[PDB]
Symmetry: D2
Subunit: 494 residues, 4 copies
Amino acid sequence: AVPAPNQQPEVFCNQIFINNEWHDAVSRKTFPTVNPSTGEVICQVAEGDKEDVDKAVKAARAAFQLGSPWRRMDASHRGRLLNRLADLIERDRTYLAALETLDNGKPYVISYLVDLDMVLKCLRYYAGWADKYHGKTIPIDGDFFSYTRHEPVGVCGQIIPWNFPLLMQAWKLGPALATGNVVVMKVAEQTPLTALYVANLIKEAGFPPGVVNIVPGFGPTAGAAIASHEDVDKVAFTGSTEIGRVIQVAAGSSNLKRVTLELGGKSPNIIMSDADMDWAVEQAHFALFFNQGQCCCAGSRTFVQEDIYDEFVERSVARAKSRVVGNPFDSKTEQGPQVDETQFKKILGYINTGKQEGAKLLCGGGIAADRGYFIQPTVFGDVQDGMTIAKEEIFGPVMQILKFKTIEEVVGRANNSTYGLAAAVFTKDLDKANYLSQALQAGTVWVNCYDVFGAQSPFGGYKMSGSGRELGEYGLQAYTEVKTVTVKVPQKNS
Amino acid sequence: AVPAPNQQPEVFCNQIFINNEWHDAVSRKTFPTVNPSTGEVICQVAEGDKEDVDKAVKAARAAFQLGSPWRRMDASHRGRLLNRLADLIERDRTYLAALETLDNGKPYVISYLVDLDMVLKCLRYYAGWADKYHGKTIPIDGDFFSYTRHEPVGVCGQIIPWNFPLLMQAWKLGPALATGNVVVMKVAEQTPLTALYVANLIKEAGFPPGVVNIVPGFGPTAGAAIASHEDVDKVAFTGSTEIGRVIQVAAGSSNLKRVTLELGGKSPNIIMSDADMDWAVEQAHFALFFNQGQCCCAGSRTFVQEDIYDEFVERSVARAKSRVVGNPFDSKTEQGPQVDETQFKKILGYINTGKQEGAKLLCGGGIAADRGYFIQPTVFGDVQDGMTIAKEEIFGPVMQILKFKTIEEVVGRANNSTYGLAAAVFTKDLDKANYLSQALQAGTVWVNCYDVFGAQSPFGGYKMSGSGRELGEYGLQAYTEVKTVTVKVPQKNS
Amino acid sequence: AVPAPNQQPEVFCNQIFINNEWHDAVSRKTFPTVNPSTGEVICQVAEGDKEDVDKAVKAARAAFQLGSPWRRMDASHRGRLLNRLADLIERDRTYLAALETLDNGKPYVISYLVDLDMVLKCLRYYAGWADKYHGKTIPIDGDFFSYTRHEPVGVCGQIIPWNFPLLMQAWKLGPALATGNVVVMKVAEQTPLTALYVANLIKEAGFPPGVVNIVPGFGPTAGAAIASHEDVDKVAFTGSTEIGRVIQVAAGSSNLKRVTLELGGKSPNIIMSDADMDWAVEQAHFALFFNQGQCCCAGSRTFVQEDIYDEFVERSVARAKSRVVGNPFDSKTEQGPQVDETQFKKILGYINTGKQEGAKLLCGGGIAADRGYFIQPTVFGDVQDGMTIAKEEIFGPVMQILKFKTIEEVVGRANNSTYGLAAAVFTKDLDKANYLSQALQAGTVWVNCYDVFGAQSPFGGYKMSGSGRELGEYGLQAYTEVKTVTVKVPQKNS
Amino acid sequence: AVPAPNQQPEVFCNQIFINNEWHDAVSRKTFPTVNPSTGEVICQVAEGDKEDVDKAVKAARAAFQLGSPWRRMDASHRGRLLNRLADLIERDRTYLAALETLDNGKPYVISYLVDLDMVLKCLRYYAGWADKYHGKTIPIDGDFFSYTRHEPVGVCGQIIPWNFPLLMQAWKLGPALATGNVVVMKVAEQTPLTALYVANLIKEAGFPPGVVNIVPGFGPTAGAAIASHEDVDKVAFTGSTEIGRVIQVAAGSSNLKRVTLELGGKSPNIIMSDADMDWAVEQAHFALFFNQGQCCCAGSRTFVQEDIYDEFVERSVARAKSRVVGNPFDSKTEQGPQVDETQFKKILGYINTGKQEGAKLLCGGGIAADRGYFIQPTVFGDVQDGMTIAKEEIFGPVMQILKFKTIEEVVGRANNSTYGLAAAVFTKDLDKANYLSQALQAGTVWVNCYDVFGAQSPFGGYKMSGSGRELGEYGLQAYTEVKTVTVKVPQKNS
Ligand SMILES: NC(=O)C1=CN([C@@H]2O[C@H](COP(=O)(O)OP(=O)(O)OC[C@H]3O[C@@H](n4cnc5c(N)ncnc54)[C@H](O)[C@@H]3O)[C@@H](O)[C@H]2O)C=CC1
Ligand SMILES: [Mg+2]
Ligand SMILES: [Mg+2]
Ligand SMILES: [Mg+2]
Ligand SMILES: [Mg+2]
Ligand code: NA
Ligand code: NA
Ligand code: NA
Ligand code: NA
């Protein structure tokens, strides 16, 4: 029961947000944001650069000064504001979902029912954390009273991707604001619209000036300025593994700012012989094709047991063929276009590489429409570990199906990767599910399900998939600076 | 690697332990402790009563006074002391195990490899908690600094049973001492020897006088004196449901002392049709016959699915018949005698009741030896829920086997009880295990195993099986008195 | 900033609330609720009894059944509902404040600014806890996977007093609902109106029927029925020490339900010679006279160091004489009438007692008005520890000022009591504050302030002032039933 | 009481420790370790390089493989091993202390009473944590069972300094092993002896081969090899800010391994006018001169209020002049030599800079002996914020005394630094203590004391003094990898 969308929502925000005010780039330059479904320019957006980031960092630092409104505000009140923001986002839920679909390309139905719902749930979850992340009173040796204060890390720089514009912003702002930090956010050049509007709601909610500053623009410019800035205390990044390296190096070369990364992946989805066929097939399909295949934890390595391989592949091909591709604003559309031309060509390149390396193309493999960046749901069979499409993150509607024999075998092959963001296991057997979930080297292991996110459960990667965790209580750790206070007392007693 | 047992160890301790000194009862009266395997008197033991308890409490209260050695002692040092106690208990391991078997009746091998090992692991586990149960610093509203202090509850009265003399003593002392409390322990009249010897080790370990006081005696006298004492801050009890009511009533009638109970049970052991036959049989046998069936969490209700009922019963009867009953000091003995004549007659009474109520006697059902309190491994088939032997805790080697058809059926029948201490589920199916583990109303739900205790995991019951939890981190809660300190500050900041 | 009150608010709810519906007592009996300011009957209210309690318990038990809307509901949604209730209460804030003052007698300004504000903050705080009270995954020994489930305790019976009707209801519902429990609340016969209206808001908020049931009536009847009920899993009570004993005894004599108590006190307020005089005097006054002296943690023992005694007393007498007593609906009124005739007589009795035992009457000591139950702000000087007015809780506007010399002395005198709910220390010295905060045996120790309650900070008493803690994270413990699930795994690995 | 030391202890270990075996450098090269008291070479030590590091990493990785003795070992047993290692270090306490003094230069009395005691306390503290760092069971939305596994981060590369050879090793091993990780440690070229002997004790303790690997050698070679290694999962470093940057960049350039740093500092020690003169002076002296001034948290900026400045300086000078310098093995020696020639010259250079920039030399300022690296206790008065000695970490016996007027002023001046390791406040006033401890931007704030370390309390720096925290429960975070397991269930219930 989704409300009828406005297939052409008006844009009210397209500038740089600093101190609750809208500013044009110091250079007065602007960059175009394109609708991936048409290829046409939606509107111009202020191209923030280093000079702009410097204005944002100063605003943030000022808002973080001891004695300031944001610093003196009750922890509970910080929770009140987060809930207020969530309320305002829900009020403009219909509009934001449409604007999200317009700039990202994802189906409006999914934007409304999934993205916006998770955004609301994330902000409201962390709202409750605002006055509960307690410090500790420590029974240290000697005549002393020792305790820890959980203080805000400070000026936090947050660089987010384009796959989940609104959700990524919520995942970042939620924990940062709940812990009393200030933010300088750098949204993706491909999807800056929705984030900018939320900035308007952040002001409306009552958040003090400088607490949240958003600087739209390119990565090598605005993004790098934040990562290398001398007054940024912490940086959180979500994107490619390549840029993650640049971020951590920039942090080490600058002021040694704290860093947390959420990189890509090549998550394995293991389907045992005793799995519920119909369920496993549908979930495997969702596991990879969700959000145009543009998901960090996408099940891009579908391992299927030999005895059920053939039937599984058959059912998967059928499901992939019936997957409706088209205008994201039409309720029947299951898959919209890719985010941009760059990703569009990169995905086609991977498909071409899959053909060249001996992967058996089962369906799709080409452009789905003349206008826009639409790609057909592609499925590759008989994929081998050594193949490129089996190692590199495609980030598109390209499924890889591999065959295995033993449970010991699949573990080693699944773990044979530089990534380790997520993993899945489909089976009815207790011991098998427990053996695999423990053995698999991944941040999140789903059993008989996939892409099950909850603001209560932490999400992060192993190995080169990133470091640190987001969501849940763990999501507060990276946004907290621990201070130990040890006081001399006349005589310590238990 | 079980050392040769001294089949008649020397008794060095048989008096009341107060202020690290041995005292006779104020009345000079004594009571005999009997060897269950022979029925002969081992030795006399001081019969502590109210006046003796009053002395112990005063000693405890004094050792708990602010500024005393026990109160000023560093938390970490409290851990060192618990570790020292452990080492001393291990030094005299062989002796303790033998003395345990002599007074209790349980097999020497079991006392050594099971009971004493667990005792060591319990004290060592809690030793590590001594300086880790932190308080909190709370981000309260307004210009204040609020924090909590986790202080000792105070004088702790601990009344334990006879089924696991040494282990029950450790389960109580470990958390109590780790949190800096003082103890006035009332051991079972049937098995006071081993506990009294440990008191010697406690003194040798370096623990300040008054910190741990042991008063051997009867329940209506010494036990009630503790539960009704006006200066006892908290009381922990383990035994029958009947006395548990008396304890709670006494606490409410006296000074409203904090209370935690670990009562009996009629724990169900559910064997699904897809379970590992051999494993389930051996575990179900162990689940009920362990420690002469004198276990609080004994699986006295063995639910078996109809499709595998016949075979399971057959195998169970065979195992029950092969269970070696005899002298506990003999390496071949698997089942020793019952703790005493009262229990001996009570068990036989239940067996006679099982026969009169229509339960099918498959094997055993009578006295296993002329001398001592030995009973044959009895197994009843086609047991119905309404049967006495299916509702009341027998606490003996009397197995009950019930048949069921559906999973929804077994859950309802398993939960239909005033008890809820523990339960078990044997199956290879993931969903079945998860369904039953969540639906069963019990403190502990074992999956494909039984009687799996770990100092790391909490143990306690639902409904009338008790309140509160022992073992694990949870075991510290009842021994902690929380104090909030809210201080006015010049200006509160995050 | 306080909206003009409706001095004669309309009563819309006066029956028994069960399954989201209003019912008359099965006996059809009703009892009058009196306005303490005029002594006139406000209206009649359904007199609930045992049969009515049975109906409520059955409704709550049904709503708690596995698979019910309340049990299946997402933890996050539980928080959503609590947040909704809070919003509804704030909407009807002006109304509830007036109704609270009408039935209780406390100043309308206080009802609006303090009571209702604290109610909103309590419900909102606990709303955030709904999906954050995590269980644990334990690294148990052997090849096992052990974890704990934090399940609801079940059918919770809550008996609240009359000194803070709305607030006491929130302190009870907040933690109970946040943890998924069901409630059968028995409000005070003197102040049932506000709680009943809130029940209307509970239904409006969307809470499933049976989740919260309110039964207005007397103690020996309705209250006892809850405490003795065989199907009530836990009971929380707040009131007199005498009734607290009856409650714990009833629990032990019935089904061994879990019990937490919040009783009275004789809280000591220590004023050191180096304290801020003007601040200590005003705070010492507030500490005692707040809410007509009807506060559990009222500073009924004001200890003042000799060197500043005379000046402190002189200023305290002046402040007490300037305390405006009168119509609680008038903005100038500081002190309204006592809750009822019974309390009125009880306080007058204590005042006479103080005069008879040698306490020096410095001001007041008699009836403040002809109509209603108004008593003059009374101050006793040169009070000694042995005097009855120094040991027993008066619960009225009667201040006791005692003199002391050293800090070691005052600690001993302040701790020499069967009560230990709260205490305070007024001093500028760091060491003195830490020495006293540690030494005082009280649940809450305020430093340079008093009556500072925060939903984030736990509240409860030591000794006979109660057991267990309310508010903060600790407030969730008593409403949680811990379940351990130990699963056998193929091979356990770190 | 201190046992008579062997001024010339025998060296038993001087090679590379891998797989519990001693290996020579692959290149067969060795480096000399010098006795700072005489300048003479103690012995040659295997100069480990990249090739030796690779051998170590592979050994650790192998020992970390699923199903290995280290991975399958019960968490409780891991604590048993740490406790055992601690018992062995205590047995060889006298020897270790002597060898520590011989290689480092610190007084034997200090090494025995301070360093070794803290080492024993650190390892025993973490020993208790081994089986207590629980994961969580999360009440996520929908029909799912979500929980987190707290697994070991993996192969941990640890690089430690020379100021506290044994203690630094303990601070690293304790948390790493308690959580089940494997270590590749690179000790300081200046102090490799004691660490290597401990490795021998690690083997004797029963630790599996490959669990702990120690590779002695230089920084740019062995240290850089660990930081840039492709198979090292996490790196912990303690040393200069300069190398900290190198380590962070090396980690980002390689496999994006998790990084935590503990760098230098310019810790401010604020003495208010109301402080206890005698105590403040003695503590300020200790704050800076401890361990030859070679302490990361050394109070290198002594802020003293003008009203007491003159008297404070006078007393400090007298104390510095009386500080006995000489043979570290002599019981009367308070200050030994500096670690090496490099530091010796560096400190002498800073002293020269202090004179050049206008700082008032009050005492010392030159070489204290003809043989060895001894420096006279130097004190500079009237130091200004802009002076080099007031900004850069000297790491020697050079004290800086600065004068201030107001508390607001000292807060700003104290926080005006790129460092933020620790700070201290000396005052008798409660408000000032709380105001400053909250305002000071430092990882550890001491009140009326200094250098109070406790294994229970976290230690780490703000800003450029490092990231993350060591000691206490927080010290376990960096050595844990969080995995979320979300299982689909039939029907979720609270
Ligand atoms: N983990 C994830 O969910 C995401 C993964 N990716 C992966 O990365 C591939 C390429 O897509 P991109 O848009 O280029 O991802 P990216 O990691 O390069 O860019 C993402 C964010 O980082 C910013 N950025 C770019 N260069 C930067 C720099 N030098 N310093 C600081 N920030 C910088 C971008 O402007 C955007 O805000 C995708 O095909 C997919 O494989 C992309 C987005 C998200
Ligand atoms: Mg890029
Ligand atoms: Mg009995
Ligand atoms: Mg009454
Ligand atoms: Mg260097
Ligand atoms: Na776009
Ligand atoms: Na006996
Ligand atoms: Na009334
Ligand atoms: Na050296």
